[PDB]
Design a protein around this ligand. Structure first.
Ligand code: 9RP
Ligand code: CA
Ligand code: CL
Ligand code: CL
Lengths: 58, 250
């Protein structure tokens, strides 16, 4: 997998590494899941999420 | 904002209102608890830097509902490459005197990594632009926060479809050429926000140019991706005396 294509399968940020290697990363206030691609909030008010809407569907 | 709709209260929680002596100046975008991104040109005419206020959690300007948070602006940082009264490098980073408190009504927009922004976000067609700007060319400003979905154009296409300052690598075009829908005076500095896989990111800043919702023309936005590294470095730096700071770019 490569970052330029389909975001390397990452939900958020992506880094290419030496080889057929890729690492996904997450913004502050998020953590990476064991799938190695998904990001989950770690705080109450993570960036780029709309509380009244997140609640609306919770 | 021309041809938009009211942003339901709390659905644009990163939106900032900038005031000078209590008067509407510009918009901005909250990117963390003490940092706001706006447009350089907003500060072209500022005489007394100490009269600058940022308001978070604002919605309806006619009332006070208790969700609003006002802060003094401690620093206004502008790139060295910005020339007053022009369009290129139209970006400013503002340091608040005290952090805002995150709430259901006050939340930062994510400042993306450059690579992500360039490789992925830049290809998301539609994005949201917001503000309390003019509702019409030569019209009154909005009392309630407005929002508009605009499509992004490749610069080549922008130029082709247009019928003026250049469109540089530090800009992009978005909107409509039919004079129905645009950002407008009073909106400058505000966010152009892009959704990807359940999260919103800062991709542009409402800049300026020739008329608002002028037939044959598109809106011009500062291309935030060009500035990520510049912004990040500044956010890691200590404040300096005196509000205005010109910082080398790149
Ligand atoms: O921001 C503006 C505009 C403006 C026009 C326009 C068109 N389309 C989109 C955005 C736009 N902004 C005009 N004057 N100022 C201004 C100048 C000095 C300080 C604060 C504001
Ligand atoms: Ca209010
Ligand atoms: Cl420093
Ligand atoms: Cl000063």
């Amino acid at each position: 997998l490569i970052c330029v294509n389909e975001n390397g399968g990452c939900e958020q940020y992506c880094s290419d590494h030496t080889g057929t290697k890729r690492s996904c990363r997450c913004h502050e206030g998020y953590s990476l899941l064991a799938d190695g691609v998904s990001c989950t909030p770690t705080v109450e008010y993570p960036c780029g999420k709309i509380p009244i809407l997140e609640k609306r569907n919770a | 904002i021309v041809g938009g709709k009211v942003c339901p209260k709390g659905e644009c929680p990163w939106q900032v209102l900038l005031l000078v002596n209590g008067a509407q100046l510009c918009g901005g975008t909250l990117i963390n608890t003490i940092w706001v991104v706006s447009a350089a040109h907003c500060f072209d005419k500022i005489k007394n830097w100490r009269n600058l206020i940022a308001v978070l959690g604002e919605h309806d300007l006619s009332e006070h509902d208790g969700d609003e948070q006002s802060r003094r602006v401690a620093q206004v940082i502008i790139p060295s490459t910005y020339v007053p009264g022009t369009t290129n490098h139209d970006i400013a980073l503002l340091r608040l005197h005290q952090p805002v408190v995150l709430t259901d009504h006050v939340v930062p927009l994510c400042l993306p990594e450059r690579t992500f922004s360039e490789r992925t976000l830049a290809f998301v067609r539609f994005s949201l632009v917001s503000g309390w700007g003019q509702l019409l060319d030569r019209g009154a400003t909005a009392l309630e926060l407005m929002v508009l979905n605009v499509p992004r154009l490749m610069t080549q296409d922008c130029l082709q479809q247009s019928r003026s300052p250049n469109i540089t690598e530090y800009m992009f075009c978005a909107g409509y050429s039919d004079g129905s829908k645009d950002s407008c005076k009073g909106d400058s500095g505000g966010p152009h926000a892009t959704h990807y896989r359940g999260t919103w990111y800062l991709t542009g800043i409402v800049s300026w140019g020739q008329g608002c919702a002028t037939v044959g023309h598109f809106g011009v936005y500062t291309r935030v991706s060009q500035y990520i590294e510049w912004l990040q470095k500044l956010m890691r730096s200590e404040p300096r005396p005196g509000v205005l700071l010109r910082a080398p770019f790149p």
